[PDB]
Swiss-Prot record:
Temperature dependence comment: Optimum temperature is 43 degrees Celsius.
Effect of residue 120 to W: In GD1 and GD2
Effect of residue 257 to Q: In GD1 and GD2; also found in a patient with Parkinson disease
Protein name stated in the entry: Lysosomal acid glucosylceramidase
Species, as recorded: Homo sapiens (Human)
Amino acid sequence: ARPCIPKSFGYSSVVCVCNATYCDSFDPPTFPALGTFSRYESTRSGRRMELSMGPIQANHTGTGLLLTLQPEQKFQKVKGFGGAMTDAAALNILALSPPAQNLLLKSYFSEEGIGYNIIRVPMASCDFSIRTYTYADTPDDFQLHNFSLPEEDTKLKIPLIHRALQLAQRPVSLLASPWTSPTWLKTNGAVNGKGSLKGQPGDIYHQTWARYFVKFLDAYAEHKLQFWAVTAENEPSAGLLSGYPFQCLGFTPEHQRDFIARDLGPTLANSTHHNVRLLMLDDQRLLLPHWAKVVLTDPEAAKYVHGIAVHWYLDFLAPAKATLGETHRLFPNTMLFASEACVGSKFWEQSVRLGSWDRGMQYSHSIITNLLYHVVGWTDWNLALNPEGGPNWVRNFVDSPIIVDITKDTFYKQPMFYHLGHFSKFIPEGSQRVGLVASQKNDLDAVALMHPDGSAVVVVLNRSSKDVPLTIKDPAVGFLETISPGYSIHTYLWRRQHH
Ligand SMILES: *[C@@H]1O[C@H](CO)[C@@H](O[C@@H]2O[C@H](CO)[C@@H](O)[C@H](O)[C@H]2NC(C)=O)[C@H](O)[C@H]1NC(C)=O
Ligand SMILES: *[C@@H]1O[C@H](CO)[C@@H](O[C@@H]2O[C@H](CO)[C@@H](O)[C@H](O)[C@H]2NC(C)=O)[C@H](O)[C@H]1NC(C)=O
Ligand SMILES: C=C(C)c1cccc([C@@H](N)CN(C)S(=O)(=O)c2cc(F)cc(F)c2)c1
Ligand SMILES: *[C@@H]1O[C@H](CO)[C@@H](O)[C@H](O)[C@H]1NC(C)=O
Ligand SMILES: [K+]
Ligand SMILES: [K+]
């Protein structure tokens, strides 16, 4: 439709520039006819999800790298992909002119963009807020008569979510997560710092907190928004830490277990929102498998927990097999879901690196990692930030796939945007990961899935500098002869028919 207008800021690759009159976009999605494949290619050298087509061939007589699809080796079904409508994201989006706002939202949520189908919604304030508040700051309101949504919700987040839903053809799922409770429910009486709910699960404090989730869902439902899931707390481990700088609420895994079993599970199940799924953890992966063991081996907690939400701070190393792998082995029927990821959080690295191919590769490598370890979806953090990586009331700035420069009424689509889009655009909800076997050792990262309609999608990431010729074999269908250029990412799509 409209190509990337590239701009360099001195990092390893380019951003695509959008403004009030222009943004890069795709034509309406169509599949290549049976016997043809589509390839979307992005490269450090500047290609941005460029479409080409090739033939599927009956024969192959190379001896080089062969990737054989395993369409009958089935893994997890995919929920989807998206990002977070924080106060910071909403403020940044709405600071653009109406035309630029629309082109930003279409970039993420339209079929002429990358087809996001998940939005994570903070329950009141977090670090990516400029005001500290909860929905029930009036103290000792245990029946939550004064619970209400402030303008951050009613004027900023909710209208933007509605606009996103209008632009999407794919059903969008919302996920809610709280950072802090009202301070009068907390041992330390502050939004931040070390502190937990007062008392113990099953008591008035805990019941009030569970009821606040229902009040939140009720309030959003009054605005005609329904949630797919909630998490039991954003990063519950954070509130166990002395001096924690911003909004938090500390739970040990035992506290979370008992809160879910006694309070949050029963309260949600008793409500009109009983179909909303409950995800535990919502925290970093080295807390697994221990946290899953503590919560899910209690049958009274386990019956309320639909899944385990994981956060990915891509700046930092941690094992995958020992965390996600072991958790899936122990609890295969409890889905894993990546509810937050970000990069740029180290104080000594530039929060926003406009055009960083490396940060793009961190996004796609993380997504592939997640999908190969059974994770059913992947959710970015802030949908948009300013060039400082904000706003953020504690200056905990980070990067975002879209960076807004309001002085030019312009926004920049980072490599991260395209790396995420190589997945989000091409993996409909209900797709199933399938196997993909390499004939020889190689430097590529790849994942294969099957759409609900049986079509194939393969993503190939090359983090190496070398162009790698390869062949994809679909045993039902034939061979795709291709190349994975150095510092590229490709998505391949084709129709599958059997004979
Ligand atoms: C939005 O960005 C576009 C693309 O850069 C601007 O349009 C370009 O303007 C330059 C300078 O006149 C032309 O040489 C290009 O040919 C234009 N490109 C296209 C695709 O039209 C546009 O002026 C910007 N809009 C605003 C409101 O600033
Ligand atoms: C379970 O859900 C029902 C709502 O259907 C709750 O019943 C309401 O309780 C409030 C007081 O908390 C009353 O003022 C309403 O009149 C009740 N409504 C109905 C329709 O019965 C019930 O309290 C909930 N139980 C819990 C949370 O333990
Ligand atoms: C191209 C194919 C099909 C392929 C088959 C087997 C192995 C490989 C490896 N070169 C890389 N893998 C270990 S991986 O692709 O399985 C992988 C990549 C990732 F980004 C995160 C991860 F945990 C595993 C490639
Ligand atoms: C494919 O393979 C066999 C090799 O013997 C041959 O019969 C056939 O003509 C080849 N070429 C094509 C285009 O199918
Ligand atoms: K209030
Ligand atoms: K930083």
